[PDB]
Ligand binder design. Structure first.
Ligand code: 2J6
Ligand code: CL
Lengths: 251, 251
């Protein structure tokens, strides 16, 4: 009875929650530069995930304590009537660490809260982490950062999506926002509601990798290409088809 | 002329090379156990990749010099008349290392040889690595290894495929071979010639993650689940549709 075109069950009452931790400025003593244009990324994401049925919850420049509280809160609430869970980090990072305002947090400890045992209402549901994070360098300019965050996998039914891979560079425009996020959001607009999600992330790889870096205004920025990637532990096709809401309570 | 359904051009004269480095025994002083059943994996892969058009080239228990010579030989030959490239490692590993007979080799230097820069004939063509490699723990017995090899990316148009992710366990049967290779090879047999390759890898993720580990002949092997993963830096849909070989030279 085995089906090679098996899809994730996406006919629950509500889509689910999409967390966005949005980090613009950092504690003085971390010496990490401003991320001017992250707020465009946050707004763009907030719109595209809204249009796909997500309850979007944005958080700006949380300290480590505040951030762990808010995520663990979400991890221990019930997602029984939800299709999936999405968690976005827009910040700096190093290795297996994302930066809150004041200190680094081990990514595995954030993903671990949503692993089958610890969050039962999400077992066998897709759990999607999108990570725009690289290393701080130390009107619309393009600022460029060296890939620093490891392209980590997680557990069954996770999809880890990374702006940039080892040996490549993450770009952010100070008004329009991150290359990766612009292209993710553009692909969500056009094909979010129809395409399989990894089919879509593959378009984002193309879009981003095709952005030319030969005739940059800054000479140093030349030849600093950006290739994103995703690490999939998904077990089925993932679609975000419009939800049948006609005469239904979805709040 | 952006196309959401764009597929890698797979209409070259030949499919390409599939390298299989198969490692059963190791130099005494490494203190690594034999990998009984890796020869089933090597024969199963040889058959499935043959049946998809690949010129399959197997190498057994090469030392680091021999292995580097053979992979450098293949990387500087012309693949201009080829759709793609497949390289498989069946060995032990640690971090970003795979084990040859006598020493560990950095995986970045192997994947580095086929990067657009260094292997022009393969630029914009899929380069596919498959890695059955865990920590050597030390009739048909099921031996279980701890995940050890990093699920790292490898640059534009690379697909890195891993038997097991951080904090899960890799299984090998001494006669039937590795769970991951069995399930991969089953899905290649049935759907290799029709399905997009990442859809296929998603079926392998389901098949392996569903294998029960609750009533094992070893008590200590109980609860040691296996979740594979793949890191995709591909920019298009990858298909291995049968090639039209009627009155055509494909050698
Ligand atoms: O992916 C994994 C698989 C495992 F079995 C165990 C641990 C990890 C996570 N580590 C990494 N993953 C991807 C790229 C680099 C690293 C990396 N690089 C250096 C140090 C630590 N991690
Ligand atoms: Cl064929």
């Amino acid at each position: 009875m085995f089906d090679p075109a098996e899809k994730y069950k996406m006919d629950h009452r509500r889509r689910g929650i999409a967390l966005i931790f949005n980090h613009e400025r950092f504690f003085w003593h971390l010496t990490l530069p401003e991320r001017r244009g992250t707020c465009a990324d946050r707004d763009n994401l907030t719109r595209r995930f809204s249009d796909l049925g997500f309850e979007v919850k944005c958080f700006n420049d949380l300290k480590a304590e505040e951030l762990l509280l808010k995520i663990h809160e979400v991890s221990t609430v019930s997602h029984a009537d939800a299709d999936c869970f999405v968690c976005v980090f827009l910040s700096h990072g190093e290795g297996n660490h994302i930066y809150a305002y004041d200190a680094k947090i081990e990514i595995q400890t954030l993903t671990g809260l949503f692993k089958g045992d610890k969050c039962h209402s999400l077992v066998g549901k897709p759990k999607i982490f999108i990570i725009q994070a690289a290393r701080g360098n130390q009107t619309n300019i393009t600022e460029v950062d060296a890939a620093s965050v490891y392209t980590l996998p997680a557990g069954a039914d996770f999809l880890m999506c990374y702006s940039v891979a080892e040996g490549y560079y993450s770009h952010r425009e100070t008004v329009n926002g991150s290359w990766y996020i612009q292209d993710l959001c553009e692909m969500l607009g056009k094909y979010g509601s129809s395409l399989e999600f990894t089919e879509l992330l593959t378009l984002v790889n193309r879009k981003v990798s095709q952005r030319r870096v030969d005739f940059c205004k800054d000479p140093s920025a030349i030849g600093k290409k950006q290739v994103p990637c995703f690490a999939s532990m998904l077990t089925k096709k993932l679609h975000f088809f419009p939800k049948s809401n006609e005469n239904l309570y979805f709040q």
